[PDB]
Amino acid sequence: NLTKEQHEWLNGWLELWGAWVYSGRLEKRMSSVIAKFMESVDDDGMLISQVVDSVMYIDKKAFGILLSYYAHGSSKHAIASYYHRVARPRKMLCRGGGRIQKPSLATCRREVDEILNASLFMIYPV
DNA sequence: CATCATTGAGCAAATGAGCAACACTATTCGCATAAGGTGGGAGTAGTGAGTCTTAAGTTGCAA
């Protein structure tokens, strides 16, 4: 797990990073997913963009979520809201049981939280 | 003599439903408008039979 100084440090880096990118100052060549986000609208931001694209290159879903939170500046609650909207029925050993249904909102909140913590966790040493 | 099935027993992991607390915005509510404007209007018209109640008119009748 990361610490909280690392949280605030790299948090501020992703704040100026997403504020830098979202103005449109980044090129297509960094990612086609970064290009995808730029279809939906300095060396610091390009260095970090190589970092974040390098680590979060492989998932692209939480990478897009990461752009939604930092580049766009969206609240966590709306992200888990739409994410609960796009939910499919899954197998979970629930408080209810191992039946197969669409999960609750608070579960989706937990998932945005843990994909946040794991995302930041995988970014930080890079 | 050993062992295991077999009956209790409780737990972590996970999750679904909240909670309070702040913070922000949509909606709603309440007040103002300076030349002058000083008695409504539709109201049905072809029911009849009865019954109770006043209201008034008349009329013995007694001091």
The values of phi and psi at residue A96, to 5°, are: -75, -55
Quick one: angle between helices A76-85 and A105-123, nearest 10? 120
Method of elucidation: cryo-EM
Query: CB of A47 under 7 A from strand B?
Result: no
Burial pattern A17-48, b for ≥16 Cβ within 10 A else e, equals bbebbbeeebeeebbebbeebbeeeeeebbeb
Contacts of A65 (CB under 8 A, 6+ apart): A79, A112, A115, A119
Query: CB of A107 under 7 A from strand B?
Result: yes
Q: Is A7 within 8 Å of A57 (Cβ atoms)?
A: no
Query: CB of A103 under 7 A from strand B?
Result: yes
Contacts of A126 (CB under 8 A, 6+ apart): A51, A54, A55
| Domain span holding position A14 | 1-126
User: What's the total number of domains in chain A?
Assistant: 1
Residue A70 CA: distances (Å) to CA of A11, A63, A67, A94? 9, 10, 5, 32
Q: Is A100 within 8 Å of A91 (Cβ atoms)?
A: yes
**If we measure between CA atoms, which residue out of A116, A16, A3 comes closest to residue A56?**
A116
Cα separation, A30 vs A71, whole angstroms: 15
Cα separation, A69 vs A116, whole angstroms: 10
Residue A121 CA: distances (Å) to CA of A26, A42, A46, A113? 24, 24, 20, 12
Query: CB of A115 under 7 A from strand B?
Result: no
Nearest nucleotide (CA of A106 to C1'): B16
Q: Is A56 within 8 Å of A124 (Cβ atoms)?
A: no
Q: Is A83 within 8 Å of A69 (Cβ atoms)?
A: no
Resolution in A: 4.1
Cα separation, A95 vs A27, whole angstroms: 47
